Symmetry: D2
Subunit: 115 residues, 4 copies
Amino acid sequence: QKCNLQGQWRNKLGSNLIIESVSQNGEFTGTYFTSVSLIRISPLTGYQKLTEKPTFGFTVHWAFSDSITVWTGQCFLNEKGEEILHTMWLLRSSQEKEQDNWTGTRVGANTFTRL
Amino acid sequence: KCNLQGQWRNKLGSNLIIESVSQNGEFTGTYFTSVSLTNSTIRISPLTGYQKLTEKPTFGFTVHWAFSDSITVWTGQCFLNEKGEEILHTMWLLRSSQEKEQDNWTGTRVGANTFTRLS
Amino acid sequence: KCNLQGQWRNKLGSNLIIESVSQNGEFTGTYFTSVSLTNSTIRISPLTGYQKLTEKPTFGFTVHWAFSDSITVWTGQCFLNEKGEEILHTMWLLRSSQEKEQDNWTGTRVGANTFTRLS
Amino acid sequence: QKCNLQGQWRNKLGSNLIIESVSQNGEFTGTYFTSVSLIRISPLTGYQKLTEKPTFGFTVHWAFSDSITVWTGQCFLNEKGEEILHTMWLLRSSQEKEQDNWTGTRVGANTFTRL
Ligand SMILES: O=C(O)CCCC[C@@H]1SC[C@@H]2NC(=O)N[C@@H]21
Ligand SMILES: O=C(O)CCCC[C@@H]1SC[C@@H]2NC(=O)N[C@@H]21
C-alpha cells in the first residue's frame, strides 16, 4: 500500500471510482459510476504524482449530461494503515448565457476508500 | 460551438495550449504557468481533459506540473463575449503535497481565471 | 490601509455598502445583488463581518439574504491597483437550502468577484 | 433539536465552535478555538436562517494573525437524530502584493457535532 491509485474506490455517496494502471508519466484512465445526480457510467482521465502520498487530479465527462466534474486530492495511509483519497471537487453545469456564468460552479469534498 | 484547440492566455499571462480534441471530447495539451508556489524553474507541463462538443461547451482538465509535487484542475465553460470573441470562464483547485494526513486541510487552494485568445 | 466603508460594485453590478467599521475590525452593512438563484424580488440584505486594520487588509463577511433561504460568505483582500484605485479581490461560497441531508453535496456554489468604487 | 446553532460544537480537527443566543433576525456571535494553524481564541459573527434545517454563515477574525476564515453550511439531523453542521470554508491569507492574490484563498469542508 503506497498509494498507487489503481483499483476500485467508493465514497460516502455510494459512487464508484475505477482507476486503471497508472502510466510511466503518472497518467491514468478509468470509469466513474455515480448514484447521485443534480445510472451513469462515465469516463475519466487524469494524473497522479509518482511520490509517496501522491497528489492527483482527474476529470469525469458525465455521460448523457452537459456537466463536468474535476477532482483533486492526495492519498494517505490512515491510522488503521489503509489507503484513503482526500479530495475536493468542482462540478460545472452548462449555463445558457455568459451572464449566468456566476451560477455554474459547485464545490465539495469527499473521501474515497477501497472497495 | 467553440474549438478549444490552440493557444489561450489568462490575465496572469499563463499560456494554455490544447493540441487536439477527439470525438469523445477528450483533449490533451500543455500549460505554461506565469506563476507558481515553488521557487523551482517553471517548465511547460502536460494536461488531459474533456470538453462537451456542444454549443458553449463546458470542459475540465488536470495539469501535471513538471516541476513540483502539486496538481491543478480547472473546469469552466466557453462563451462568446459582446465583441464575438471566445472566452473561457474557469475555476480551479490547486492541490499541494502535504507531509501527513493531519495537514490535509491546508492542501487545497481555489481561484478563478478567464482565458482569451492571444492578441 | 483601505477604508472598507462606503459603496462598492462588482462586475455584475451588485452593490456592497459597508456602514461602519469598529476598532476590533467588526463591520456591518448591506448588499444588493444584481443576480439571484430565486425568482423572488431581490431586496437589500444585511451583512456582518470583520476586516484586519492593516495595510492591504483581508476581510470576510456573511450576507443574510432577505428574500431567500440562502446564505453567501465572501473573503478577500484590498489592494491598490496600478492607477492607485482601491480594489477588493474576493471569493465567495453561496449556500442554498437543501431539503434533506443526503442532498447536502449539491448545496454549495463557489465564485470570485472583484469590487471597485462607483465610477 | 431543531438546529438552533446556540451552544458548543467541535470538528474533526479538534477545533471548538462556541455560538451564542441567536437574535430575532438570525444574527449570532461567538468564539472559535482552533488546535490547527497554517492556541488562539478568536471572535466570530454571522447569521442563521430561521427555518427548519437552517443555512448559516460566519466569519472568524483570527487573533494574532492577518488571516480570515468564512464558513457557510446547513444544519441537519443525522440518522441517529442528532444535529450536525455540514460546512464549507474559505481561508484567506494576507498577501504582500496584488500580483500574489491568486495564491491567497484556501478552501475546505468540515462537519461539526455538538460537545
Ligand atoms: O507551484 C506549484 O506547485 C505549481 C504551480 C501552480 C500554478 C497555479 S495553479 C492555478 C493558477 N493558475 C495559473 O495560471 N497558475 C496558477
Ligand atoms: O438567490 C438566492 O438564493 C440569493 C442570491 C444569490 C446572489 C449570489 S451570491 C454570490 C454572487 N455575487 C453576487 O453579487 N450575487 C451572487
